[PDB]
Amino acid sequence: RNLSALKRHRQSLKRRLRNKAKKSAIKTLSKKAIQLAQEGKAEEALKIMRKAESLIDKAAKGSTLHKNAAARRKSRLMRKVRQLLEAAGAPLIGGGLSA
Amino acid sequence: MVKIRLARFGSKHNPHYRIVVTDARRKRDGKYIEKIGYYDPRKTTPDWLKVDVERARYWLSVGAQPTDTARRLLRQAGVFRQE
Amino acid sequence: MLTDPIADMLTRIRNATRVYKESTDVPASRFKEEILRILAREGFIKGYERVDVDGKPYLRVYLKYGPRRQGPDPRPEQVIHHIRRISKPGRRVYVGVKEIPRVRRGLGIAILSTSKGVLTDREARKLGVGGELICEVW
Amino acid sequence: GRYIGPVCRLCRREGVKLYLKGERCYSPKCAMERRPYPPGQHGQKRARRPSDYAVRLREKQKLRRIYGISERQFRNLFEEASKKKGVTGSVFLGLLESRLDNVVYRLGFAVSRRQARQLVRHGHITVNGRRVDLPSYRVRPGDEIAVAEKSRNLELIRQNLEAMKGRKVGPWLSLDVEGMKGKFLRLPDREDLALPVNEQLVIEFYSR
Amino acid sequence: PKKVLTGVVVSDKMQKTVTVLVERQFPHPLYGKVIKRSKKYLAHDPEEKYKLGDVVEIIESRPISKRKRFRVLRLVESGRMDLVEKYLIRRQNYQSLSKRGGKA
Amino acid sequence: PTINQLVRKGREKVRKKSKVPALKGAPFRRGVCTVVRTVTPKKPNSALRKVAKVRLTSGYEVTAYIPGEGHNLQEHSVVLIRGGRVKDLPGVRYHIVRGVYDAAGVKDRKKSRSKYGTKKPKEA
RNA sequence: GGCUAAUCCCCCAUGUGGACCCGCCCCUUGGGGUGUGUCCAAAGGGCUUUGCCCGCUUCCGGAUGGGCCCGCGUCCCAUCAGCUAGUUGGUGGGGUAAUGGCCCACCAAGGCGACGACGGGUAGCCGGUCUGAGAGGAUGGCCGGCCACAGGGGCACUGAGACACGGGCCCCACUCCUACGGGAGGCAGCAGUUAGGAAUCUUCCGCAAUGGGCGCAAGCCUGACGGAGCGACGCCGCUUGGAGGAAGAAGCCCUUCGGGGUGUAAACUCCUGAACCCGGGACGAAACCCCCGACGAGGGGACUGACGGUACCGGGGUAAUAGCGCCGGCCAACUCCGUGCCAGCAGCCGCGGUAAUACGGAGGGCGCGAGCGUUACCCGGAUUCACUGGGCGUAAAGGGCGUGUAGGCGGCCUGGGGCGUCCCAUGUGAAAGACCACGGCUCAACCGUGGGGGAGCGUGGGAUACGCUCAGGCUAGACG
RNA sequence: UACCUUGAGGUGGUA
RNA sequence: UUUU
Numbered sequence A: 001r002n003l004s005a006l007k008r009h010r011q012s013l014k015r016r017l018r019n020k021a022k023k024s025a026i027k028t029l030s031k032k033a034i035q036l037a038q039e040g041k042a043e044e045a046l047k048i049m050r051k052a053e054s055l056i057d058k059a060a061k062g063s064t065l066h067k068n069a070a071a072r073r074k075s076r077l078m079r080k081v082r083q084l085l086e087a088a089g090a091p092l093i094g095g096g097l098s099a
Numbered sequence B: 001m002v003k004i005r006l007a008r009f010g011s012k013h014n015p016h017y018r019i020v021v022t023d024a025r026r027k028r029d030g031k032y033i034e035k036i037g038y039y040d041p042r043k044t045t046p047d048w049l050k051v052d053v054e055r056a057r058y059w060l061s062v063g064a065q066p067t068d069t070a071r072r073l074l075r076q077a078g079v080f081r082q083e
Numbered sequence C: 001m002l003t004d005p006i007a008d009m010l011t012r013i014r015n016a017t018r019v020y021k022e023s024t025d026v027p028a029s030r031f032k033e034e035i036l037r038i039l040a041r042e043g044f045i046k047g048y049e050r051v052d053v054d055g056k057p058y059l060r061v062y063l064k065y066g067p068r069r070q071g072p073d074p075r076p077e078q079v080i081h082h083i084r085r086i087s088k089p090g091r092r093v094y095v096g097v098k099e100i101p102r103v104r105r106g107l108g109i110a111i112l113s114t115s116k117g118v119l120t121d122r123e124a125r126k127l128g129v130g131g132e133l134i135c136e137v138w
Numbered sequence D: 001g002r003y004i005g006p007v008c009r010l011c012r013r014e015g016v017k018l019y020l021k022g023e024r025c026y027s028p029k030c031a032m033e034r035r036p037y038p039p040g041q042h043g044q045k046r047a048r049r050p051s052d053y054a055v056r057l058r059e060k061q062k063l064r065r066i067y068g069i070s071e072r073q074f075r076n077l078f079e080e081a082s083k084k085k086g087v088t089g090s091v092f093l094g095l096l097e098s099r100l101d102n103v104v105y106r107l108g109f110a111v112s113r114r115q116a117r118q119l120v121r122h123g124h125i126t127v128n129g130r131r132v133d134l135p136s137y138r139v140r141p142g143d144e145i146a147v148a149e150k151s152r153n154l155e156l157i158r159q160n161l162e163a164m165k166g167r168k169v170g171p172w173l174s175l176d177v178e179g180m181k182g183k184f185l186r187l188p189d190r191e192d193l194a195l196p197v198n199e200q201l202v203i204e205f206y207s208r
Numbered sequence E: 001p002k003k004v005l006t007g008v009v010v011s012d013k014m015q016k017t018v019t020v021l022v023e024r025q026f027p028h029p030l031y032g033k034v035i036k037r038s039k040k041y042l043a044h045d046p047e048e049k050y051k052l053g054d055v056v057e058i059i060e061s062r063p064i065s066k067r068k069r070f071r072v073l074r075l076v077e078s079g080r081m082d083l084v085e086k087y088l089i090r091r092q093n094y095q096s097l098s099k100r101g102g103k104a
Numbered sequence F: 001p002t003i004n005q006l007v008r009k010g011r012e013k014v015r016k017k018s019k020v021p022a023l024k025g026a027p028f029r030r031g032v033c034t035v036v037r038t039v040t041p042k043k044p045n046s047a048l049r050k051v052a053k054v055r056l057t058s059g060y061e062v063t064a065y066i067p068g069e070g071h072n073l074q075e076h077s078v079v080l081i082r083g084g085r086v087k088d089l090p091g092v093r094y095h096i097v098r099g100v101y102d103a104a105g106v107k108d109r110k111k112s113r114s115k116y117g118t119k120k121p122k123e124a
Numbered sequence G: 001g002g003c004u005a006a007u008c009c010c011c012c013a014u015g016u017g018g019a020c021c022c023g024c025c026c027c028u029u030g031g032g033g034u035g036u037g038u039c040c041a042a043a044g045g046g047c048u049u050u051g052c053c054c055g056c057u058u059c060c061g062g063a064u065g066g067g068c069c070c071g072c073g074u075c076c077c078a079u080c081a082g083c084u085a086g087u088u089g090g091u092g093g094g095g096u097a098a099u100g101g102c103c104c105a106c107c108a109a110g111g112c113g114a115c116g117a118c119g120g121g122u123a124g125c126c127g128g129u130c131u132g133a134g135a136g137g138a139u140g141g142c143c144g145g146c147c148a149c150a151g152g153g154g155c156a157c158u159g160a161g162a163c164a165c166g167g168g169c170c171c172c173a174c175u176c177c178u179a180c181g182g183g184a185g186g187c188a189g190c191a192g193u194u195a196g197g198a199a200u201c202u203u204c205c206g207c208a209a210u211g212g213g214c215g216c217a218a219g220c221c222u223g224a225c226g227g228a229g230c231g232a233c234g235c236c237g238c239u240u241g242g243a244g245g246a247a248g249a250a251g252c253c254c255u256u257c258g259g260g261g262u263g264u265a266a267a268c269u270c271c272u273g274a275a276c277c278c279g280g281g282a283c284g285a286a287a288c289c290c291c292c293g294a295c296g297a298g299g300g301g302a303c304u305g306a307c308g309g310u311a312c313c314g315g316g317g318u319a320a321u322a323g324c325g326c327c328g329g330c331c332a333a334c335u336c337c338g339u340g341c342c343a344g345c346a347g348c349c350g351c352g353g354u355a356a357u358a359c360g361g362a363g364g365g366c367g368c369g370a371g372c373g374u375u376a377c378c379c380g381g382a383u384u385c386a387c388u389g390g391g392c393g394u395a396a397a398g399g400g401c402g403u404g405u406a407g408g409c410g411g412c413c414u415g416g417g418g419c420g421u422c423c424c425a426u427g428u429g430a431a432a433g434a435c436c437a438c439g440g441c442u443c444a445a446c447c448g449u450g451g452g453g454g455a456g457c458g459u460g461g462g463a464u465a466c467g468c469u470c471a472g473g474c475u476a477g478a479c480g
Numbered sequence H: 001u002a003c004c005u006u007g008a009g010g011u012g013g014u015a
Numbered sequence I: 001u002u003u004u
């Protein structure tokens, strides 16, 4: 028995737990940003989009997200924010959107 | 990683290889990418090694790492000479 | 209404010769005329001319036979021993130049219709084309 | 194995002299020489009209029973002859005439074909220098069939290559008696051979 | 090259989607007789531009959905239910040739 | 038929019916004799043929002939079947290979020995 | 619970560059460019220690591998005819590397079918293999490509890549351990066991060679592989002897009792000499590495074989396995005796009821020969599912008749298009196999190299007689 | 099992 | 009467 590959498993678990955590924030902030936008709170709705952006690319740094997966997220996010701010918004900090 | 190695084609005790380009992960005698030569280790004929420096040089120029033996054979056929 | 006019002509000819008629009429058509043009050149018929039967355009096909023979049944040998329709409505038959057949080790002919016109297997092969294998004749 | 056994009996069944003994088959004793009726308790009774089949069967036997080849090898050769270009019957005969054991016979190094065969399997023969012990070895044109020095001094080889002095040999061949060596000049042309076999019938035995 | 096919539009009943009946011809692999088979393609009509009876070209395209991988390249000839009819009648014939019998 | 009809129905390929449900399309099937006994020929023959009802391993129960001048089979004899019908005994479609299992070979058999499974006598 | 290193994780920075939103430009499905805004990098180690090696980060591209989609093709039953709700489509969203009812919410009511839907049966597909004159039939084992599966079912995690045979989780069945709470397993890897079966091998040698993973390298790992073992299972090669030898031994067989046969066969003489023995003894192996040269080119040097003491070479040397089927016709080979519709033979026709070339035996004969027969199965012959290539008055076969739907088929002349059809060029058609030639092993089987053909399909160009389509015309079909 | 009778059998007859 |  005993085939030291259980190691690969051990590691997978640590990695799993690391990815899991990273994605979780990305979601939380994304939602959060989407929420403030759908409320007209432009200055900070962007403020947070900026963080979400960072966290996404950052996740894509290693193998948590990686790929065009990162890009989709960034896309869909800016997509929903700029659009929701179509309620008088008027991008302030433009902390991410290029108007 | 594509390679330039030998492929077994003779018969029991009558080995005959084929210098060949292929993806490192394929069976040694499997689907190769291109044959770029042949080689008879027992030199049963005055023609026991042929290459095609032109093609060898193409693949080399695009990755293709050769086996030590293949590298050897390629060299012997003037693949790397520059003089 | 005729179903396959070329087959009709092929048959009218076949029949008429079995009773050794001098000539025999067939409703006219460019296409039928074109085939006749070959039957004549290849020397299977003494030739043909356009007549006007009862007001309509027909084609006298003058038939040809061998000479009177010895013993019983002195009927001449037929010049046209065989004439078969091949391609037919409801089973058209085409061939590439490479697929044009050779009728009786050459002793006969096959008439095919090509975009270079109605040719014999010799002519077809020469012009290097193929087409709808119309009929066989020997 | 290759038959081994009463041979001047095959001669009798085939009703013709097959030379499977060289000498004696010339003396007043080949049996075909006085006692021409087939072997066995029935050979003298009047024969019944043979079926076309019987003819070809007997005809194929005659031809094969001459070179001492096994039906197996005989068949394979004929198949090779068929597939090859040129008139099969011809090609077949030539191919048989190309067996080394046979050449060794045509050249006289040996009395009969069986004897010849043994001289080959026993290494007394050489081809272009290197010795060859394969009775079925096919000789190409230009090859030098010979005796190996180590064998040139054997009583049998002597009597044999001696009796060959002055004796002429097949036109598709050539022999240098003193050098105990000969050459396979050309595939014997059908006309060169004078076998008591109508090979057309053999081609037919294998068509059925 | 993205495949291009021609056919008649035999169904409008879908949003931004038309059913194009494409007829095909060819020699029977063993009997020679030139036979005629056909197949319906659900092509993408974004601006619901094409209607029943429209002979249209169909172009091989990126999946727009399931069962839908062609867009209408263009309009060949308009109006001509003679075709839609053949089709419709053939479908209606199926009518009851089951336990009873269709309609002739 | 017309070509169009052939295009529509085509020719029906010939199905081949086995004459030896020795199942598995095996060359031989083994079983055990349920019964052993004589049987009368048909058409114009007359005799007391030796047969056998065999409980087959192929899950079958069939009757098999016992070729030879004489045998040694009983209600519990293991046997190997080969398949070969006896033209005279309708119902018998298989033979029992002799020399295999409880089926001894044919004693004092001098000729067609390979059949009837009998070793070459030490004649001399 | 506590301590701790890093090429482990994180934050800030630099922004070649790249990602995302918006605009504009070129392109045209999400391709390429550009402007502002935002966001995003890194790891060190070794030294022949100021340089070089291994390596790290971001981006563009190459190469190889791959996902997804599409046209066409792919077995049997219609005694399966109707099927369908994520079901067909739409808008938005989720999801992924990516398109998509893939998934979801919402709306529409669609989608499929006799050109055979749906259901049932069977089955991995192919290059090819076998057969066949061909068309075709049958087949898919070895080898090569693709697919699928890893005790049965489901699931996701980690990763460039898996939904992962020798990773993980859960349920099920079974086995094992059990202090009864709970645990451990998964040979469809090599070999081997057992069970099933008519039937299918060694718990072998080696990592030397080719190939693979990791390592700068030495080198480690490799039941992949290279070899040996067992089985006539197949193919090919070889032997059991060669020459002489009586008008003819003996024995056995037949007999018109003269003789005939086995038979030159044996005996016997002479010759060669498979086995066996002695000696020698291999290619497959020259790279990696080290030295010189710049760790390059190039040159120099060293190590290394399981098979194997095997192949092969030389010397010596013994006459030294033959069997199986068949002999009524088809079908090549005949007589005696025994038996007496018995015992038995038998592929079909048939043979045996006191003369049996058909049963059993014997002599003899034919066939083939380390085989020969048998059984099973595939193609053939079988133009006996007929496309090539059949039929239907009485042989099997015209529907009891009509009307008519779909469909199949379509008179003469002209013109347009050029779908079918035909032509040229080009791409594709892997290797192996098959064919041809030459070559390596003494031959061959086996293998190496080279050559040639090739349907189908894609692309570009062309032809227009026939079929098709469109347009016009006609009157011989048809109808009035 | 035997003879009658069959070419040989079945039946049938005679022990 | 069965079989020739």
Ligand SMILES: [Mg+2]
Residues within 6 Å of the ligand: none
């Ligand atoms: Mg590790």
Ligand SMILES: [Mg+2]
Residues within 6 Å of the ligand: C093
């Ligand atoms: Mg035809």
Ligand SMILES: [Mg+2]
Residues within 6 Å of the ligand: D081, D082, D083, D084, D085, D086, D087, D088, D091
């Ligand atoms: Mg030939």
Ligand SMILES: [Mg+2]
Residues within 6 Å of the ligand: F044, F045, F046, G341
């Ligand atoms: Mg009888």
Ligand SMILES: [Mg+2]
Residues within 6 Å of the ligand: F112
């Ligand atoms: Mg027998």
Ligand SMILES: [Mg+2]
Residues within 6 Å of the ligand: none
């Ligand atoms: Mg702790």
Ligand SMILES: [Mg+2]
Residues within 6 Å of the ligand: G015, G017
């Ligand atoms: Mg920048």
Ligand SMILES: [Mg+2]
Residues within 6 Å of the ligand: none
């Ligand atoms: Mg810049």
Ligand SMILES: [Mg+2]
Residues within 6 Å of the ligand: none
């Ligand atoms: Mg940063």
Ligand SMILES: [Mg+2]
Residues within 6 Å of the ligand: none
């Ligand atoms: Mg890192």
Ligand SMILES: [Mg+2]
Residues within 6 Å of the ligand: none
């Ligand atoms: Mg690529």
Ligand SMILES: [Mg+2]
Residues within 6 Å of the ligand: none
């Ligand atoms: Mg189905």
Ligand SMILES: [Mg+2]
Residues within 6 Å of the ligand: G123
């Ligand atoms: Mg299956």
Ligand SMILES: [Mg+2]
Residues within 6 Å of the ligand: none
């Ligand atoms: Mg045939």
Ligand SMILES: [Mg+2]
Residues within 6 Å of the ligand: none
């Ligand atoms: Mg395979």
Ligand SMILES: [Mg+2]
Residues within 6 Å of the ligand: none
């Ligand atoms: Mg599973």
